[model samples]
Target chain A: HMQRGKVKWFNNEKGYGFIEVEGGSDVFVHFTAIQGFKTLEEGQEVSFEIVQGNRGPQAANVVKL
Target chain B: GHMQRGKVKWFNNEKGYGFIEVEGGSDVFVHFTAIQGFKTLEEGQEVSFEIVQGNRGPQAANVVKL
Candidate 1:
């Protein structure tokens, strides 16, 4: 299933960010998981799916809307 | 909207990359990041996408399964 969220913050230097999903805690998102590196923006609406990573739930296939 | 329709020729899940066979053109390179919704792409799947010039060559972006 796809989860909709708004980008909380994205550090270009760090290449990571968090997505605030409704009724759920923030999900970690890595730059490599984003469709286009230059596309992500703070407060941007996006849709993504979660994957079980080594740390915890991570976002994948993130697409901006 | 530079939207184009194509069929997936082959995709390697492990490598997270694939190629789409577009009519009247060479295969376009598709990375997993370009995919929306599903990261795993299967061979012979129909898809719609926009083409962008990558650092190396033409690559597929915003790829959606049809």
Candidate 2:
């Protein structure tokens, strides 16, 4: 499935954070998924897909919205 | 790692975009979005530009026509 989420707070230095899925739970998002400068802004809305990682659901193919 | 020079491979004046073949490196994506001497580019022209990562991949910026 797909989800359009809002960045709760992405640490540009750490390159990772969580996205507050619209009407859903938090999802882990990594900068590697974003193609634009490999980074995301805090409190920004983004679209991405979720996949099960070793830790938990991680955001992949994240796009700036 | 910047300011590569090359000749126009081809430019679609109507579409306002084209590709440039780097002298020794890989090709680049050139669009009217980058400017000087003209926002649009002339065909088969010698040009130089900075290689910046674009929405797709390597794209030309600050393109200068010579």
Candidate 3:
């Protein structure tokens, strides 16, 4: 399932960021996970899938809305 | 373990087919059904996929738009 959240911050140079999910801690997101958008910006609303990454929970199949 | 990355050369919505240019390899054919989500694709769209030998030629499977 996709979870809705807002982008907390994204560093184009580093190509990674975090998403603030409602009622939950921020989720890590990588550039490869984002779709249908060229770049990510803070405060941008998006929907994404939560996956158990090697380190911790990460977002996948992220789409900006 | 042979995942590849490429860009969409072109996608014919009517034909429901397209081609992806893998780096240092021949273009691979891609079908709409091979796509994981949102069948719609655009030219120059970056994607990651796996190539498999099809009945015709190299075909892209598990195509995911990046």
Candidate 4:
């Protein structure tokens, strides 16, 4: 099932952010998942994959493009 | 298999049916039985619904409260 998450934090320097999905764990979102946008601003809605990460929850095969 | 999840993109409460557009995927059919919450669905409401294999296509299954 598709998961939904709101943009939690976006770090321009690191080009990463956290998304908290409903009834699910928060996931790490990187610029690579920023689709074609120039940058991900705070509160910008996005969707990403739910997958295992080396250290924590992460979005796999993320693509904003 | 796990059903894809998406938000309540649109719903005609009067009709008692709606559509859920899965993230990065096409839309799927959602009936009232597929709804999970005590409250009626509104636009943009996030939910995780199951997919029941059907002759026409995959339909939403037991939608749990989100």
User: DockQ of candidates 1 onward, in order?
Assistant: 0.02, 0.03, 0.01, 0.02
- What is candidate 3's CAPRI-style docking category based on DockQ? incorrect
Please list all clashing residue pairs in model 1, or write none if there are none.
none
Candidate 3 Cα outliers beyond 4 Å, as residue runs: B1-66
Query: lDDT per model, in order?
Result: 0.82, 0.75, 0.82, 0.66
Share of native interface contacts recovered by each model: 0.00, 0.00, 0.00, 0.00
TM-score for each prediction?
A: 0.49, 0.47, 0.48, 0.45
Evaluating just chain A, the predictions reach TM-scores of 0.89, 0.85, 0.91, 0.68
lDDT of 4 by residue, A1-65 (tens): 55666777767776766776678656767666655647766665666667654323466544432
Give the CAPRI rating of model 1.
incorrect
Better candidate by TM-score, 2 or 4: 2
Model 4, residue pairs in steric clash? A1-B3, A1-B4, A1-B5, A2-B4, A2-B5, A35-A64, A35-A65, B50-B61
* Ranking of all predicted structures according to TM-score, beginning with the best and ending with the worst: 1, 3, 2, 4
Residue B43 of candidate 3: its Cα lDDT? 94
- The better-scoring model by TM-score among 3 and 4 is 3
The best-first sequence of candidates by lDDT reads 1, 3, 2, 4
Candidate 2 local Cα displacement, residue B39, angstroms:
5.7
lDDT at position A10, candidate 1: 80
lDDT of 1 by residue, A1-65 (tens): 88999999886666776888888878878887897657577999999999975334678999998
Stretch of 10 with least lDDT, candidate 4 chain A: A53-62
Q: What is candidate 4's CA lDDT for residue A8?
A: 73
Q: Interface RMSD (C-alpha) of each candidate?
A: 9.8, 11.5, 15.9, 16.9
